[PDB]
Short mmCIF file of C-alpha atoms and ligand atoms in Angstrom, two decimals:
data_model
loop_
_atom_site.label_atom_id
_atom_site.label_comp_id
_atom_site.label_asym_id
_atom_site.label_seq_id
_atom_site.Cartn_x
_atom_site.Cartn_y
_atom_site.Cartn_z
CA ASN F 1 6.17 -3.35 -5.34
CA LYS F 2 4.52 -0.60 -3.14
CA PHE F 3 0.94 0.71 -3.51
CA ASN F 4 0.59 -0.57 -7.11
CA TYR F 5 -2.16 -1.91 -9.40
CA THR F 6 -0.24 -4.97 -10.49
CA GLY F 7 -0.41 -8.32 -8.75
CA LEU F 8 0.90 -8.35 -5.19
CA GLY F 9 0.94 -4.56 -5.13
CA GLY F 10 -2.62 -4.32 -6.45
CA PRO F 11 -6.08 -3.83 -4.85
CA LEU F 12 -6.62 -7.51 -4.17
CA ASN F 13 -3.71 -7.35 -1.76
CA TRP F 14 -3.68 -3.83 -0.36
CA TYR F 15 -4.71 -5.08 3.08
CA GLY F 16 -1.73 -7.39 3.05
CA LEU F 17 0.45 -4.37 2.34
CA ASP F 18 -0.32 -2.74 5.70
CA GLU F 19 -2.94 -3.48 8.37
CA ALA F 20 -4.06 0.15 8.07
CA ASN F 21 -5.94 -0.94 4.96
CA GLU F 22 -8.69 -3.04 6.55
CA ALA F 23 -11.39 -1.08 4.76
CA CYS F 24 -9.92 -2.02 1.38
CA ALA F 25 -10.75 -5.62 2.12
CA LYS F 26 -13.44 -5.57 4.84
CA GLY F 27 -15.42 -2.46 3.87
CA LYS F 28 -19.10 -2.75 2.93
CA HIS F 29 -19.10 0.67 1.25
CA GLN F 30 -16.07 0.52 -0.99
CA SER F 31 -15.53 2.53 -4.21
CA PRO F 32 -15.67 2.48 -7.19
CA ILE F 33 -19.05 0.99 -7.90
CA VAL F 34 -21.25 0.35 -10.88
CA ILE F 35 -23.74 3.17 -10.87
CA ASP F 36 -27.23 2.24 -11.87
CA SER F 37 -28.59 5.47 -13.31
CA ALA F 38 -32.23 4.57 -12.54
CA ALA F 39 -31.37 3.64 -8.97
CA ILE F 40 -28.83 6.15 -7.44
CA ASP F 41 -29.85 9.47 -5.88
CA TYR F 42 -29.20 12.66 -7.76
CA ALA F 43 -27.87 15.62 -5.83
CA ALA F 44 -30.88 17.84 -5.21
CA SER F 45 -30.76 21.10 -7.12
CA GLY F 46 -29.03 23.87 -5.19
CA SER F 47 -27.75 21.43 -2.58
CA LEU F 48 -24.31 21.59 -4.18
CA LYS F 49 -22.12 24.63 -4.65
CA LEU F 50 -18.83 24.18 -6.46
CA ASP F 51 -16.37 27.07 -6.41
CA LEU F 52 -13.28 26.92 -8.67
CA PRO F 53 -11.45 30.26 -8.90
CA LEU F 54 -8.96 30.99 -11.67
CA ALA F 55 -5.54 29.63 -10.78
CA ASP F 56 -1.95 30.18 -11.86
CA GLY F 57 0.25 27.34 -13.07
CA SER F 58 0.27 24.60 -10.46
CA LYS F 59 2.25 21.52 -9.56
CA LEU F 60 1.42 18.68 -12.00
CA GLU F 61 3.17 15.52 -10.81
CA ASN F 62 3.86 12.04 -12.07
CA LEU F 63 2.69 10.00 -9.08
CA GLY F 64 3.76 6.75 -10.73
CA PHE F 65 0.52 5.13 -11.93
CA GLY F 66 -1.07 8.52 -11.41
CA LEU F 67 -1.19 12.12 -12.55
CA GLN F 68 -2.15 14.77 -10.01
CA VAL F 69 -2.44 18.54 -9.92
CA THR F 70 -1.97 20.16 -6.53
CA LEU F 71 -4.36 23.06 -5.97
CA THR F 72 -5.79 24.59 -2.78
CA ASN F 73 -8.03 27.35 -4.09
CA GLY F 74 -11.51 25.80 -4.39
CA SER F 75 -14.57 24.64 -2.46
CA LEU F 76 -17.62 22.41 -2.44
CA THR F 77 -20.55 23.24 -0.20
CA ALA F 78 -22.90 20.35 0.48
CA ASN F 79 -25.79 22.02 2.27
CA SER F 80 -24.23 23.34 5.43
CA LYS F 81 -20.86 21.63 5.21
CA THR F 82 -17.99 23.19 3.26
CA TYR F 83 -15.05 21.16 1.94
CA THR F 84 -11.94 22.87 0.62
CA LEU F 85 -9.92 21.67 -2.40
CA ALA F 86 -6.78 19.61 -1.84
CA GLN F 87 -5.92 18.33 -5.33
CA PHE F 88 -7.37 16.78 -8.49
CA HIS F 89 -6.21 13.76 -10.45
CA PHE F 90 -6.91 11.28 -13.20
CA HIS F 91 -7.68 7.64 -13.69
CA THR F 92 -7.53 5.67 -16.87
CA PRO F 93 -9.69 3.78 -17.51
CA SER F 94 -12.48 5.27 -15.43
CA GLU F 95 -13.05 3.66 -12.10
CA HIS F 96 -16.81 4.00 -11.92
CA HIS F 97 -19.10 2.54 -14.58
CA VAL F 98 -22.59 3.68 -15.55
CA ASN F 99 -25.18 1.04 -16.40
CA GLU F 100 -22.07 -1.16 -16.55
CA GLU F 101 -20.32 1.00 -19.17
CA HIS F 102 -16.79 2.18 -18.43
CA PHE F 103 -15.05 5.23 -19.87
CA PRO F 104 -11.52 5.92 -21.08
CA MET F 105 -10.89 8.45 -18.26
CA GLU F 106 -12.10 9.78 -14.91
CA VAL F 107 -11.13 12.97 -12.96
CA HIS F 108 -11.29 13.25 -9.21
CA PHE F 109 -11.43 16.58 -7.44
CA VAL F 110 -10.73 15.91 -3.78
CA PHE F 111 -12.06 18.21 -1.04
CA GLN F 112 -11.76 18.12 2.74
CA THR F 113 -12.90 19.76 5.94
CA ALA F 114 -10.96 20.48 9.13
CA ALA F 115 -12.63 17.33 10.45
CA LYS F 116 -10.85 15.49 7.61
CA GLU F 117 -14.25 14.48 6.23
CA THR F 118 -13.86 14.04 2.49
CA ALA F 119 -15.99 14.75 -0.57
CA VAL F 120 -15.23 14.14 -4.27
CA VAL F 121 -16.35 15.71 -7.49
CA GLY F 122 -15.72 13.43 -10.43
CA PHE F 123 -16.10 13.73 -14.17
CA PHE F 124 -16.27 11.08 -16.83
CA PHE F 125 -14.45 11.45 -20.13
CA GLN F 126 -15.67 10.18 -23.49
CA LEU F 127 -13.62 10.17 -26.69
CA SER F 128 -14.90 12.88 -29.02
CA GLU F 129 -15.60 11.77 -32.56
CA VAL F 130 -15.06 15.31 -33.87
CA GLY F 131 -11.82 16.14 -32.03
CA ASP F 132 -13.49 18.28 -29.33
CA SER F 133 -11.71 19.09 -26.07
CA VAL F 134 -11.88 20.74 -22.69
CA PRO F 135 -9.42 23.68 -22.85
CA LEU F 136 -9.05 23.46 -19.08
CA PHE F 137 -7.71 19.92 -19.29
CA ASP F 138 -5.77 20.68 -22.43
CA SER F 139 -4.07 23.26 -20.25
CA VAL F 140 -3.52 20.64 -17.56
CA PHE F 141 -2.17 18.01 -19.96
CA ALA F 142 0.09 20.40 -21.94
CA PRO F 143 3.29 19.79 -19.86
CA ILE F 144 3.10 16.00 -19.58
CA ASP F 145 6.23 15.68 -21.72
CA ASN F 146 8.19 17.02 -18.77
CA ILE F 147 7.31 14.34 -16.27
CA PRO F 148 7.95 10.87 -17.79
CA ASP F 149 9.46 9.49 -14.59
CA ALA F 150 7.50 8.71 -11.46
CA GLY F 151 8.29 11.16 -8.68
CA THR F 152 9.00 14.09 -10.98
CA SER F 153 6.86 17.25 -11.18
CA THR F 154 6.23 20.26 -13.40
CA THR F 155 3.86 23.20 -13.78
CA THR F 156 0.66 23.65 -15.72
CA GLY F 157 -0.53 26.73 -17.53
CA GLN F 158 -3.19 29.01 -16.19
CA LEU F 159 -6.15 26.90 -15.12
CA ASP F 160 -9.53 28.46 -15.97
CA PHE F 161 -12.47 26.35 -14.74
CA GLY F 162 -15.17 28.47 -16.35
CA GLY F 163 -16.22 25.71 -18.69
CA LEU F 164 -15.91 22.79 -16.29
CA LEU F 165 -17.86 24.76 -13.71
CA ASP F 166 -20.94 25.39 -15.68
CA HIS F 167 -20.90 21.99 -17.25
CA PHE F 168 -21.13 20.70 -13.70
CA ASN F 169 -23.95 23.14 -13.14
CA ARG F 170 -25.90 22.32 -16.28
CA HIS F 171 -26.05 18.57 -15.53
CA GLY F 172 -27.24 16.04 -13.00
CA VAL F 173 -25.00 14.71 -10.29
CA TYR F 174 -24.95 11.06 -9.30
CA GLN F 175 -24.57 11.00 -5.55
CA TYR F 176 -23.65 8.29 -3.07
CA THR F 177 -21.58 7.61 0.03
CA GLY F 178 -18.56 5.41 -0.48
CA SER F 179 -14.82 5.43 -0.01
CA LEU F 180 -11.38 6.34 -1.28
CA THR F 181 -10.39 4.31 -4.32
CA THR F 182 -6.85 4.13 -3.01
CA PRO F 183 -5.46 2.86 0.30
CA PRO F 184 -6.55 3.04 2.91
CA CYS F 185 -9.92 3.20 1.15
CA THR F 186 -11.27 5.19 4.06
CA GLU F 187 -15.06 5.13 4.08
CA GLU F 188 -17.61 7.92 4.47
CA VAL F 189 -16.55 9.74 1.30
CA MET F 190 -19.19 11.92 -0.31
CA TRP F 191 -19.30 11.00 -3.99
CA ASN F 192 -20.57 13.46 -6.55
CA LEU F 193 -20.23 12.46 -10.17
CA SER F 194 -21.34 14.61 -13.07
CA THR F 195 -23.81 12.59 -15.16
CA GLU F 196 -22.47 13.88 -18.46
CA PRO F 197 -19.02 13.04 -19.78
CA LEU F 198 -16.46 15.57 -20.95
CA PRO F 199 -14.94 15.52 -24.48
CA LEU F 200 -11.57 13.84 -24.80
CA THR F 201 -9.23 13.68 -27.80
CA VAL F 202 -7.26 10.68 -29.00
CA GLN F 203 -4.07 12.72 -28.72
CA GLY F 204 -4.77 13.54 -25.08
CA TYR F 205 -6.00 10.04 -24.14
CA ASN F 206 -2.89 8.36 -25.49
CA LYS F 207 -0.57 10.98 -23.98
CA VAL F 208 -2.07 10.38 -20.54
CA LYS F 209 -2.50 6.61 -20.84
CA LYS F 210 1.20 6.30 -21.61
CA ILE F 211 2.10 8.17 -18.41
CA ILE F 212 -0.49 6.67 -16.07
CA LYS F 213 -0.43 3.20 -17.66
CA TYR F 214 -3.39 1.76 -15.74
CA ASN F 215 -4.62 2.92 -12.37
CA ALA F 216 -8.20 1.86 -11.77
CA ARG F 217 -9.59 -0.13 -8.88
CA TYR F 218 -11.90 -2.95 -9.92
CA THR F 219 -15.58 -2.23 -9.10
CA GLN F 220 -17.02 -3.29 -5.73
CA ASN F 221 -19.92 -5.19 -4.28
CA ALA F 222 -23.12 -3.23 -3.86
CA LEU F 223 -23.31 -0.76 -1.03
CA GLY F 224 -23.79 -2.38 2.34
CA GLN F 225 -22.94 -5.78 0.85
CA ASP F 226 -19.87 -7.65 2.06
CA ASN F 227 -16.60 -6.54 0.58
CA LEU F 228 -16.40 -8.96 -2.27
CA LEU F 229 -13.00 -10.15 -1.09
CA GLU F 230 -14.46 -11.38 2.17
CA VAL F 231 -17.07 -12.99 -0.06
CA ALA F 232 -14.33 -14.75 -2.00
CA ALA F 233 -12.70 -15.71 1.29
CA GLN F 234 -15.42 -18.21 2.08
CA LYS F 235 -13.70 -20.98 0.22
CA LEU F 236 -12.50 -21.88 2.42
CA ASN E 1 -26.66 -12.03 -12.06
CA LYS E 2 -25.01 -14.89 -14.09
CA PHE E 3 -21.44 -14.93 -15.44
CA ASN E 4 -21.07 -11.12 -15.21
CA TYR E 5 -18.31 -8.58 -14.53
CA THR E 6 -20.25 -6.71 -11.90
CA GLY E 7 -20.06 -7.46 -8.18
CA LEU E 8 -21.40 -10.85 -7.20
CA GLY E 9 -21.42 -11.93 -10.84
CA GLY E 10 -17.85 -10.82 -11.42
CA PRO E 11 -14.40 -12.50 -11.44
CA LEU E 12 -13.86 -12.14 -7.72
CA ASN E 13 -16.79 -14.47 -7.19
CA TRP E 14 -16.85 -16.76 -10.21
CA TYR E 15 -15.84 -19.77 -8.11
CA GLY E 16 -18.78 -19.08 -5.86
CA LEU E 17 -20.95 -19.19 -8.97
CA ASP E 18 -20.24 -22.87 -9.64
CA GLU E 19 -17.66 -25.25 -8.21
CA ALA E 20 -16.54 -25.98 -11.76
CA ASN E 21 -14.66 -22.71 -11.56
CA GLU E 22 -11.91 -23.65 -9.07
CA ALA E 23 -9.18 -22.53 -11.47
CA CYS E 24 -10.61 -18.99 -11.51
CA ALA E 25 -9.80 -18.77 -7.83
CA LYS E 26 -7.10 -21.39 -7.13
CA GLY E 27 -5.12 -21.33 -10.38
CA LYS E 28 -1.44 -20.36 -10.36
CA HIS E 29 -1.43 -19.68 -14.12
CA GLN E 30 -4.44 -17.43 -14.58
CA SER E 31 -4.98 -14.89 -17.37
CA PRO E 32 -4.83 -12.00 -18.16
CA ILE E 33 -1.42 -10.97 -16.91
CA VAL E 34 0.79 -7.94 -17.09
CA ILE E 35 3.28 -8.71 -19.80
CA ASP E 36 6.79 -7.54 -19.16
CA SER E 37 8.15 -7.03 -22.66
CA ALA E 38 11.80 -7.55 -21.58
CA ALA E 39 10.90 -10.76 -19.73
CA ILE E 40 8.34 -12.89 -21.73
CA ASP E 41 9.32 -15.30 -24.49
CA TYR E 42 8.70 -14.33 -28.07
CA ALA E 43 7.36 -17.02 -30.36
CA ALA E 44 10.36 -18.24 -32.33
CA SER E 45 10.24 -17.26 -36.01
CA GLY E 46 8.47 -19.85 -38.19
CA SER E 47 7.20 -21.67 -35.11
CA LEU E 48 3.78 -20.16 -35.69
CA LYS E 49 1.57 -20.57 -38.75
CA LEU E 50 -1.69 -18.67 -38.80
CA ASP E 51 -4.15 -19.47 -41.59
CA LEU E 52 -7.22 -17.22 -42.09
CA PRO E 53 -9.04 -17.87 -45.33
CA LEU E 54 -11.53 -15.40 -46.80
CA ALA E 55 -14.96 -15.82 -45.26
CA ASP E 56 -18.54 -14.90 -46.10
CA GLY E 57 -20.73 -12.98 -43.70
CA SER E 58 -20.72 -14.73 -40.34
CA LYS E 59 -22.71 -14.75 -37.13
CA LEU E 60 -21.88 -11.62 -35.06
CA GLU E 61 -23.65 -11.89 -31.72
CA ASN E 62 -24.33 -9.74 -28.70
CA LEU E 63 -23.18 -12.05 -25.89
CA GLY E 64 -24.20 -9.58 -23.25
CA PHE E 65 -20.94 -8.06 -22.01
CA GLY E 66 -19.39 -9.48 -25.11
CA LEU E 67 -19.23 -9.37 -28.90
CA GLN E 68 -18.32 -12.52 -30.75
CA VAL E 69 -18.01 -13.64 -34.34
CA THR E 70 -18.54 -17.32 -34.98
CA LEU E 71 -16.14 -18.68 -37.62
CA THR E 72 -14.77 -22.17 -38.23
CA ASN E 73 -12.51 -21.69 -41.24
CA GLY E 74 -9.02 -21.05 -39.85
CA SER E 75 -6.02 -22.61 -38.16
CA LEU E 76 -2.94 -22.04 -36.04
CA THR E 77 -0.03 -24.45 -36.23
CA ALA E 78 2.30 -24.40 -33.28
CA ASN E 79 5.18 -26.55 -34.39
CA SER E 80 3.56 -29.95 -34.86
CA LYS E 81 0.21 -29.27 -33.24
CA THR E 82 -2.65 -27.76 -35.25
CA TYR E 83 -5.54 -25.86 -33.63
CA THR E 84 -8.61 -24.99 -35.67
CA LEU E 85 -10.63 -21.79 -35.30
CA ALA E 86 -13.77 -21.72 -33.15
CA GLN E 87 -14.57 -18.00 -32.92
CA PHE E 88 -13.10 -14.59 -32.26
CA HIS E 89 -14.26 -11.85 -29.89
CA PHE E 90 -13.55 -8.52 -28.27
CA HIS E 91 -12.76 -7.09 -24.90
CA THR E 92 -12.89 -3.49 -23.86
CA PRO E 93 -10.69 -2.40 -22.18
CA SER E 94 -7.93 -4.81 -23.08
CA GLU E 95 -7.39 -7.60 -20.58
CA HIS E 96 -3.62 -7.88 -20.88
CA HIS E 97 -1.30 -4.94 -20.20
CA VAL E 98 2.20 -4.33 -21.60
CA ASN E 99 4.79 -2.85 -19.25
CA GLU E 100 1.66 -2.08 -17.21
CA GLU E 101 -0.04 -0.06 -19.94
CA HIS E 102 -3.56 -1.11 -20.92
CA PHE E 103 -5.32 -0.56 -24.27
CA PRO E 104 -8.84 0.45 -25.22
CA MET E 105 -9.48 -2.93 -26.92
CA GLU E 106 -8.31 -6.53 -27.29
CA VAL E 107 -9.32 -9.26 -29.83
CA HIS E 108 -9.17 -12.95 -29.08
CA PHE E 109 -9.04 -15.58 -31.79
CA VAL E 110 -9.80 -18.89 -30.13
CA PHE E 111 -8.48 -22.15 -31.60
CA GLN E 112 -8.87 -25.79 -30.52
CA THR E 113 -7.70 -29.32 -31.22
CA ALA E 114 -9.69 -32.56 -31.05
CA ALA E 115 -8.06 -33.02 -27.63
CA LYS E 116 -9.78 -29.77 -26.63
CA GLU E 117 -6.36 -28.21 -26.02
CA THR E 118 -6.68 -24.45 -26.63
CA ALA E 119 -4.52 -21.69 -28.11
CA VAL E 120 -5.28 -18.00 -28.56
CA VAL E 121 -4.15 -15.34 -30.98
CA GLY E 122 -4.68 -11.87 -29.54
CA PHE E 123 -4.33 -8.35 -30.86
CA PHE E 124 -4.11 -5.05 -29.03
CA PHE E 125 -5.92 -2.00 -30.29
CA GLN E 126 -4.67 1.58 -29.96
CA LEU E 127 -6.71 4.68 -30.86
CA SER E 128 -5.39 6.17 -34.10
CA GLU E 129 -4.68 9.88 -34.00
CA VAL E 130 -5.20 10.16 -37.76
CA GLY E 131 -8.45 8.20 -38.06
CA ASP E 132 -6.83 5.00 -39.35
CA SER E 133 -8.64 1.69 -39.25
CA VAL E 134 -8.48 -2.03 -39.94
CA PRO E 135 -10.98 -2.64 -42.78
CA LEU E 136 -11.36 -6.23 -41.59
CA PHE E 137 -12.69 -5.05 -38.22
CA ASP E 138 -14.59 -2.23 -39.82
CA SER E 139 -16.35 -4.99 -41.70
CA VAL E 140 -16.88 -6.87 -38.41
CA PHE E 141 -18.22 -3.81 -36.57
CA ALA E 142 -20.47 -2.56 -39.40
CA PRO E 143 -23.66 -4.35 -38.26
CA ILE E 144 -23.48 -3.55 -34.54
CA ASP E 145 -26.61 -1.39 -34.79
CA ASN E 146 -28.58 -4.58 -35.32
CA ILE E 147 -27.71 -6.28 -32.05
CA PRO E 148 -28.37 -3.88 -29.14
CA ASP E 149 -29.88 -6.55 -26.92
CA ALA E 150 -27.96 -9.35 -25.33
CA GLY E 151 -28.80 -12.72 -26.92
CA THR E 152 -29.47 -11.29 -30.38
CA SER E 153 -27.29 -11.96 -33.45
CA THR E 154 -26.65 -10.60 -36.93
CA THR E 155 -24.31 -11.11 -39.90
CA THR E 156 -21.08 -9.42 -40.85
CA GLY E 157 -19.90 -8.50 -44.31
CA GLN E 158 -17.22 -10.43 -46.11
CA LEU E 159 -14.27 -10.94 -43.79
CA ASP E 160 -10.91 -10.60 -45.55
CA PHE E 161 -7.97 -11.23 -43.20
CA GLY E 162 -5.23 -10.31 -45.66
CA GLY E 163 -4.22 -7.31 -43.61
CA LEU E 164 -4.50 -8.83 -40.17
CA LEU E 165 -2.60 -11.86 -41.35
CA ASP E 166 0.50 -10.15 -42.52
CA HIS E 167 0.49 -7.71 -39.63
CA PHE E 168 0.67 -10.75 -37.43
CA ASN E 169 3.50 -11.98 -39.61
CA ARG E 170 5.49 -8.74 -39.70
CA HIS E 171 5.64 -8.44 -35.90
CA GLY E 172 6.79 -10.17 -32.73
CA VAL E 173 4.51 -12.43 -30.75
CA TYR E 174 4.45 -12.40 -26.97
CA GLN E 175 4.04 -15.98 -25.88
CA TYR E 176 3.14 -17.64 -22.61
CA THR E 177 1.04 -20.41 -21.12
CA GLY E 178 -1.98 -19.30 -19.15
CA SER E 179 -5.72 -19.71 -19.01
CA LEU E 180 -9.14 -18.70 -20.26
CA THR E 181 -10.11 -15.22 -19.15
CA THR E 182 -13.65 -16.44 -18.62
CA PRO E 183 -15.06 -19.25 -16.48
CA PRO E 184 -14.01 -21.79 -15.94
CA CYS E 185 -10.64 -20.14 -16.60
CA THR E 186 -9.30 -23.53 -17.71
CA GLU E 187 -5.51 -23.59 -17.64
CA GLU E 188 -2.97 -24.73 -20.21
CA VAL E 189 -4.00 -22.15 -22.82
CA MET E 190 -1.37 -21.21 -25.35
CA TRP E 191 -1.25 -17.47 -25.46
CA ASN E 192 0.06 -15.66 -28.50
CA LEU E 193 -0.19 -11.89 -28.54
CA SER E 194 0.92 -9.73 -31.45
CA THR E 195 3.37 -7.17 -30.05
CA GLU E 196 2.09 -4.35 -32.22
CA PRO E 197 -1.34 -2.77 -31.73
CA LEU E 198 -3.90 -2.34 -34.46
CA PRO E 199 -5.40 1.09 -35.40
CA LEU E 200 -8.77 1.86 -33.86
CA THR E 201 -11.06 4.82 -34.53
CA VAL E 202 -13.04 6.81 -31.99
CA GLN E 203 -16.24 6.01 -33.87
CA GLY E 204 -15.56 2.29 -33.66
CA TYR E 205 -14.33 2.31 -30.04
CA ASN E 206 -17.42 4.09 -28.82
CA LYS E 207 -19.76 1.93 -30.91
CA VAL E 208 -18.30 -1.24 -29.39
CA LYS E 209 -17.86 0.10 -25.83
CA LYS E 210 -21.55 0.95 -25.70
CA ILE E 211 -22.46 -2.62 -26.71
CA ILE E 212 -19.94 -4.50 -24.63
CA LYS E 213 -19.98 -2.01 -21.72
CA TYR E 214 -17.03 -3.49 -19.79
CA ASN E 215 -15.80 -7.06 -20.00
CA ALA E 216 -12.23 -7.39 -18.81
CA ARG E 217 -10.87 -9.63 -16.10
CA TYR E 218 -8.55 -7.88 -13.66
CA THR E 219 -4.88 -8.88 -14.08
CA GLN E 220 -3.50 -11.88 -12.16
CA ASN E 221 -0.58 -12.75 -9.95
CA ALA E 222 2.63 -13.71 -11.75
CA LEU E 223 2.74 -17.13 -13.35
CA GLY E 224 3.23 -19.92 -10.87
CA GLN E 225 2.40 -17.55 -8.03
CA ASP E 226 -0.67 -18.25 -5.89
CA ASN E 227 -3.91 -17.05 -7.37
CA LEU E 228 -4.10 -13.63 -5.80
CA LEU E 229 -7.51 -14.41 -4.31
CA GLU E 230 -6.07 -17.23 -2.27
CA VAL E 231 -3.42 -14.66 -1.31
CA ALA E 232 -6.17 -12.31 -0.19
CA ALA E 233 -7.75 -15.21 1.67
CA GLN E 234 -5.90 -14.39 4.93
CA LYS E 235 -8.04 -13.78 6.65
CA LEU E 236 -11.77 -14.10 7.52
C1 LIG L 301 -5.03 31.15 -4.17
O1 LIG L 301 -5.65 32.31 -3.64
C2 LIG L 301 -4.81 33.36 -3.16
C3 LIG L 301 -5.76 34.47 -2.70
O2 LIG L 301 -6.47 35.06 -3.79
C4 LIG L 301 -3.82 33.84 -4.22
O3 LIG L 301 -2.84 34.68 -3.61
C5 LIG L 301 -3.13 32.67 -4.95
O4 LIG L 301 -2.56 33.07 -6.18
C6 LIG L 301 -4.07 31.51 -5.30
N1 LIG L 301 -3.28 30.35 -5.72
C7 LIG L 301 -3.07 30.03 -7.01
C8 LIG L 301 -1.95 29.07 -7.27
O5 LIG L 301 -3.71 30.48 -7.97
C1 LIG L 302 -15.62 -22.45 -44.89
O1 LIG L 302 -15.07 -23.33 -45.86
C2 LIG L 302 -15.94 -23.95 -46.79
C3 LIG L 302 -15.05 -24.79 -47.70
O2 LIG L 302 -13.98 -23.96 -48.12
C4 LIG L 302 -16.67 -22.91 -47.62
O3 LIG L 302 -17.54 -23.52 -48.59
C5 LIG L 302 -17.39 -21.91 -46.69
O4 LIG L 302 -17.76 -20.73 -47.39
C6 LIG L 302 -16.52 -21.40 -45.54
N1 LIG L 302 -17.37 -20.73 -44.56
C7 LIG L 302 -17.53 -19.39 -44.55
C8 LIG L 302 -18.76 -18.86 -43.85
O5 LIG L 302 -16.74 -18.59 -45.06
ZN1 LIG L 303 -8.92 9.04 -7.62
ZN1 LIG L 304 -11.55 -13.33 -24.55
#
C-alpha cells in the first residue's frame, strides 16, 4: 500500500517507504501541529496579500484519500515574496488543532515560487448548527458524485472566491514555519491559517468524508523539538 | 504533560511516559485498527448478550481529553463468560475506521470480569442530515455545560438504554481481539463494534468536541504485525 494513511502505508512509516522522506521522521519542524492560540504569532496586518481571481470550472480529482482542485490563477504575497497558486485540497478530519481542539475539515491552498519555496493558506471548517454554507465550497463539492474511484477526475462549477477572500481578510491569521503534511514532508513551509472556521453542512461533510475516508497526519512534537518518532526510537 | 494526545504526552511517546506501557509500543495486537468489513469476524448470532438496565442519574465527568459516565449496572455475556459494566465514554473523532472511513464520534462501553479480563462494546456515530438523535445520549450530553474544566463532574438524567439495546441487537457486530486504546494499552481486549452507526446532531457533536477537544489514538498495524513504532524504529 503506497503513500497511505493506514498502517504500513501511513505516516509512522513514510520514511520506510522511500529514503527521500527523511524529514517525515527526522524533522524538527514537522506539520501539523497543535496551535496554541495564546502562543503562536499572528500574521501582521497588511503583511499578507491573498489574490483569488474568479475561475472557470476546474479539475476536481479523487486523489485516493484526498480531494484536490487544480487551479493556477492565484497569489499570496508575504511582504516582498510572491507565491503563485498550484492547487487546493481538503483533509478530514482537520490536521491542525487549536488549543487541542480538532475540526471536521481543513482546506489547504498551496502556493509556490520559482525557487520552489512553498507557502500555505489553510481554513478550518466547523459544522453549522443552522445549515449554513460557503457557496464557494458548495460549488467545489457539487460534482463529487462523479469521482467515486481514486484516480478519476471531473470539473467544478464557476469558482467565486469573493466570500472566502474577505473572510480571510476580516480575521486573524495563525502563522508559523513548518512542513508539508504529506511526503516528503519538506520543511520550510510558510503556514498561514485563518483563525476563524468556515461553515460546513452535514450533507457536505458526509459527502466528502465518504470520498476522502481519512487523510490526516497525526500532530507533531513542538517546533524545534525532536521528531517524535526519533523520540520513540530511544527504546531501544 | 501527563497521559495526553499532544506531542510528548501523546501515543507516540506513552511508553516513554512509564515503563508500564510497553504494550503501547511493542504490542502486536494494538487498538484501534482499520476494520476491513469483508475480512473481520462478525459475532455469531446469540453469542452475545448485552444487558443494560434502566439507570438513575450517574456521574458524568470531564476527564480532560475525555468524557466518561460511571455506571455499574450492566453486563455482556460472551458465550459462557460474563463481563460486568464499569463505565462508558466517548472519543472524537472515532478511533476505529471502517473500510478506512472514520466517524465524528465513538462510544466505548467497558466491561470486566473478576479476572480483570476486559471486553468492549463500541458504537459509531454519524452526523444525521435530518437532525435525528439518540435520546439516551441526548440525556447523557444534557449536563455538559456543568463540567467545562478537567477534573470536574456532574450528573446525567435518567439513562434508558431501550433504544441502544435493540439497535445493538438488530445489527451485525464486528469482532476482534485487541487492546485498550489508552495506556497501558493492555492486550487481550474483546472488541465488539456495532456495524451500524448511531445518529448524531451538529449541536451535540460540537458540544462534545469542545469539551473533549481531540482524544483518538492513531490506527495501528494489522493484528499480529509488529507495533508500527517498532517498525519505525529503524533507525536512530
Ligand atoms: C487564468 O487566467 C487567464 C488570464 O486571465 C485566463 O485566460 C484563464 O481563464 C484563467 N484560468 C481559469 C481556469 O479560470
Ligand atoms: C443499580 O442497581 C441497584 C439494584 O438494582 C439499584 O438499586 C440502583 O438504582 C442501580 N444504580 C443506578 C444508579 O441506576
Ligand atoms: Zn494538505
Ligand atoms: Zn475508549
